Amino acid sequence: RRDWENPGVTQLNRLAAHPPFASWRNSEEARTDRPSQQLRSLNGEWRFAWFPAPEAVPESWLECDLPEADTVVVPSNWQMHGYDAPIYTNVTYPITVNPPFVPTENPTGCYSLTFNVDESWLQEGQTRIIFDGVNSAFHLWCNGRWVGYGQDSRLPSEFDLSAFLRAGENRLAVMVLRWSDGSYLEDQDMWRMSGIFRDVSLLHKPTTQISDFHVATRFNDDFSRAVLEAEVQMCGELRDYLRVTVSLWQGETQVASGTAPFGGEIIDERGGYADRVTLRLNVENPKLWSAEIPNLYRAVVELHTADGTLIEAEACDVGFREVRIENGLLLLNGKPLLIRGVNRHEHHPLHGQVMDEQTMVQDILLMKQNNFNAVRCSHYPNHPLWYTLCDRYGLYVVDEANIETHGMVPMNRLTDDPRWLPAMSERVTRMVQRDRNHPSVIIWSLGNESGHGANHDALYRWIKSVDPSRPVQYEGGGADTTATDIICPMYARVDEDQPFPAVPKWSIKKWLSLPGETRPLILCEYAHAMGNSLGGFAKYWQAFRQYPRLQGGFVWDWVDQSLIKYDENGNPWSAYGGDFGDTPNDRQFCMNGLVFADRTPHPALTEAKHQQQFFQFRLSGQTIEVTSEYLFRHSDNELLHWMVALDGKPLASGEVPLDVAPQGKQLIELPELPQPESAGQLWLTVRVVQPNATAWSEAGHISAWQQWRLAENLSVTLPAASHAIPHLTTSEMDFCIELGNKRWQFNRQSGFLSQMWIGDKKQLLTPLRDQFTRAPLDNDIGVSEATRIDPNAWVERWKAAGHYQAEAALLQCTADTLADAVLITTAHAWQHQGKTLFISRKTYRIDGSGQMAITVDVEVASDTPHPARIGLNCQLAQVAERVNWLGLGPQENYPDRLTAACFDRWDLPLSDMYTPYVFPSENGLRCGTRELNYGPHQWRGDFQFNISRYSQQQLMETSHRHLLHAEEGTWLNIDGFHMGIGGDDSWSPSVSAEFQLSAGRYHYQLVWCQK
Template sequence: MQQHDSHSAAAATFHQILAREDWQNQTITHLNRLPAHPTFASWRDTDAARKNQPSAFRRRLDGQWQFSWARSPFDVDARWLEDDLPDSRSTPVPSNWQMEGYDAPIYTNVRYPIDTTPPRVPEENPTGCYSLTFSVDESWRTDGQTQIIFDGVNSAFHLWCNGEWVGYSQDSRLPAAFDLSPYLQPGDNRICVMVMRWSAGTWLEDQDMWRMSGIFRSVWLLNKPTLHLCDVQLTPQLDALYRDAELLVNLSVAAPVALLEALTVKIELWDDDRLVASHQQLPGSPIIDERGSYAERAAIRLPVERPALWSAETPNCYRAVVSLCRGDETIEAEAWDIGFRRVEIKNGLLLLNGKPLLIRGVNRHEHHHQRGQVVTEEDMVQDILLMKQNNFNAVRCSHYPNTPRWYELCNRYGLYVVDEANIETHGMVPMNRLSDDPAWLPAFSARVSRMLQSNRNHPSIIIWSLGNESGGGGNHEAMYHWLKRNDPSRPVQYEGGGADSATTDIICPMYARVERDQRIPTVPKWGIKKWISLPGEQRPLILCEYAHAMGNSLGNFADYWQAFRDYPRLQGGFIWDWADQAISKT
């Protein structure tokens, strides 16, 4: 009887959650999702962090999960929260369910794959029900905070643990983390993930690509100690001579105020086995406002003499280790590869370390002909090596943030990256219908702010992009100014505002001709030679897309490159695109 009552209560809660239809509301970008942060591993000693050894406190949940498919969320049996449904079968995670025999992949460029009015999506909304049973060490259950992190789920999902609802997230291309600590139990634990193919977020994801669904990136468990680092921002800065440097570290600590006085934060900068610089101090920030002081924050400047500079040609990386300590004890350490480089625009030129860049770039989707949108580290390394062998030096993440490992590889191998927000509304009429609607500002802004908060520590990222083909509107203006305030160390680009847009530091048209103007009424495109000569125009020009390579073998390529060499402010471009999005499936 008690078990029946428990099931009835869980079923009632399940149906109440579905009745809210959170996925139909663009203002609900998440429920209970943790703030975005850089990739953490939560080492418990600095040596392991420095050497980037596998962390005992970060565990991958990839593998075989149980999966069942339904035509809509409302067709899912609530008993799934307790046990797998009769039609469930084993499926790999990560994967796209369309590549595993369920539902149909859809390829479309401009036209949306759904025919409803934003933010609504169809009631018949294919839904994947994933479940996994796992156990954790007792210390993970009783000490600190145990997070579950989904690197990518398309397009929105609800999460349950041991029958209790945990939270909700949309935005298919950025990590979503939740605190599992209150829900874990001794022995086996069961998580259930309900993934909706369509959500309000779908209206912001109208990219030219296959439309697929599922848990298509890795899933992780991360155990953070009770006292832990909850955010770390690393900003390398060079002096005016591009010779000496400092590492600006802004961090925040999760700890009761009463314990903060016993803690210190330590910053170490390593060049392989050589300690380059270090500093240790109490947490504490001079910031004071109506809340009072911020004792859990710290801003530290670490001087570095004559570091080896980072560029695509010389990707010199240092290992920055940030530790939270109590006396001689290391409570937690986090670490990242960083590079000292300075990105700026001066006299109409995009400069890296004081020298003009010539972008030999390419647009790249995350795609594999057998796995759909699931890419492995081997796939990524192969792409990078092919790019380097063929003299590419830059890649545009078209048109969304990539899997976190991609940036780490670009740091080490040496590629300049344009990191692009997961925003495209190409099929809207007019195209800026959503970007100029204040009701959509929270959804737009979350995608840009979380991209910055997740990826800002990577030296390979030299430019932020507000998205792709979404027209121009007030939401872009708000996002542009937010990025400039929160990261003045990088320029921001966006093509969609047209010739006179003030929301881009770089003129970044797509398919502008070398000589000939294209007098499109809404967004005229001048010949690129003429464009940089317009009265009052002082920005560099880098084509975000050009030389469309799908079947025409880079037409007029020599003309473009002659112009790039003849006109210093024409600083290259990104070929469309790296690889055909073919799939070996009928």
């Protein structure tokens, strides 16, 4: 019997799912969550062996471990230890598509462990083992005797060893298989790893047990009186003297309690459950749970005798909140939620999908500090400690069943087949039974991207029938089917319609106005942050804040899924798909997160933080209108810090405390702002600073900022008459301008600024030319390979039009000396296969004061695709440690993503100017720059600049950031106009028409001088 090639069998001798168990023998130990000696952790040093097929495993392994077997740690994935190559794939399966059969060459991992068992465990009670996660299917042996079989990978597998364990030395043999019939429901977008990647533990229970416990909460309209209903189940013998006490505690103070003998209310015609008891606990003025104030209660259930002797005590964390939908609005505690969620994948920086507490808490801190209040357990149930930490820290959780069939044709091939209904039934109902007692879990989910079948909606309202206290959503079928209470499309744009056949992704504003539609809309996946991405986030959040039924969304995703490889010298470097020999693979589509693998924040995280602030600001005259977006908390740990700056120079500042009601409005009256007579721009910047340190933030954390533009003083002064006039010399091939120490050189053959001389030091390695092309971004490439070309991609449109191949042709190049200047006129044209794409006419004015002025006027054809850039390109010959610029910053920004950047004077090292994207592309651009200083050079005007040690060409050719090499000198690209980056999705052109360089005629001015 090949049980891994049969969907009809998913378990053998497996115990039922339940909330998580510790088997305390003392109520005080259960109350404070001290560790229980009845619960042993089997994580540690295990014996591992690898085989290319399950049939290749010798039967001598069942008796004793092989001498050739190595020793690994548990939990771990054997792919990271060299036994196999991990495969990543987005859509196509890593195996042949022939369900339910897997290929014969099935990688097999044989785990072995020897240990000791106390004799008190064998004398009484039941001893069970828990496998929190095994990818994918496994067979279990105890002392050479077969125990059971498991199939699910993200839910615990429990087996009984009471009749199998022996006193003294005991050996457990586990045969893990990489592929199984359940792997056809595991087509999620991650590195396809395998092994025992979660905790293994032993649990001991008495003869009469606590089988399961359900916790539910019921409120009134004012949320001042709450009823705590506790359903209690037992396994074992039925005696009259067994009693149950459910006690609620806040800190060390008991709130409510109740004792009832076993026996339930009459449900049907001849009685009810005799092994189930009901407890109704009354709480007066409870502290409601929320993402802002995570108020928690400790409920300790205990199974004891009428004399008071305790048999077993179980505890859980209880949060008093309700999630319900009326009038098409998702309400939590009576208030409409605004979800600031983000998709999260279990990806350890070093251990693959082996998840620990440290990285969990670091993730929660980084998410809460960046104004995220929700998380989507995508696309699988998570490690149960994650939900506990979400209770402790206050994050909303969307629990999702581990179901994805993205590789069938069509999408609903398996999900409409009734033969696969038992598999997804045991994959949904067990997770519902496990994580139903967590108040952080507020929305259930059936899975991601599996089409619409009858089994899906059947499970959806099975969850509605069993757990009515939580809404449940589903994507597949067009996000408008009967299997969802919340409209949840993938990457639906704010305004532009994309009508695909039979699954149309309408714009969310138009979607909510569809005939007969009433459900609220929360995006399960939107704003693809793949590399240099996340443009138009401001449009999404303006739509969310304007519309009452637009309740936010989940950004895909949090962390890049990149694995660490080593070079010939042992230096680590992040790797993506195809770097391990796996074929096929979607090449870098595993890096879509807002942070790196080592939890280093991307520049997009700052924009995501700014667009999700809980405080909104409006400047009217001299008053500031502060609007709070908090739903349940009062502003008690915030103060408003304003500052008025004239061109980066501070003039006035101060601190005002904040007192705003939840969803309230407060007026701040600023003192008399200073009125300067000097030229410049007055910028008013306000910040909300938290003085005290919370459980997720440190003292001085900034949560919101906003900056405006005050009264301006335009410069009407005139430069002084320079006593020295520039000397112009005409050569047969060259134009040279002298000012004494300063010398410029223009090449008449190329028509560009050839060289510049300060004393005897040359300043440029390549001549100052134009640049209408950037390194292609991840959103810019799309899903196009070298083998398969996508004509809709921007980069393919540019290289088909010859933007990357056009050669500059010199049309005119004249020089003439003026009264207090030397004037240079040039005019070029870029032609590809006889078609003129761009025409630029420059005017270099060399003043006697030393400043040299560049006026660029560019004509762009529109039949060719719109250029990504209109600007200048040069390579400086001097490498400076510090770079000064006055403008938006200090982080990387773009024309569609600049709302988070602040206009000020910024000083940064040159290494911080280049952000280290794993796939090299256009990066480091800073918009709204009025002045730029680098070494002895100063640039003034209105431009977008980026500065690095790497040329654009090297960023195009090189595919790994570790293969990039610093070039001689310093590369600089000053751009008068830049095209937005998009970010709605990474497979279609997502750049809005307002951010495309499509005017046709462009003009910008530059001033070059030495400071």
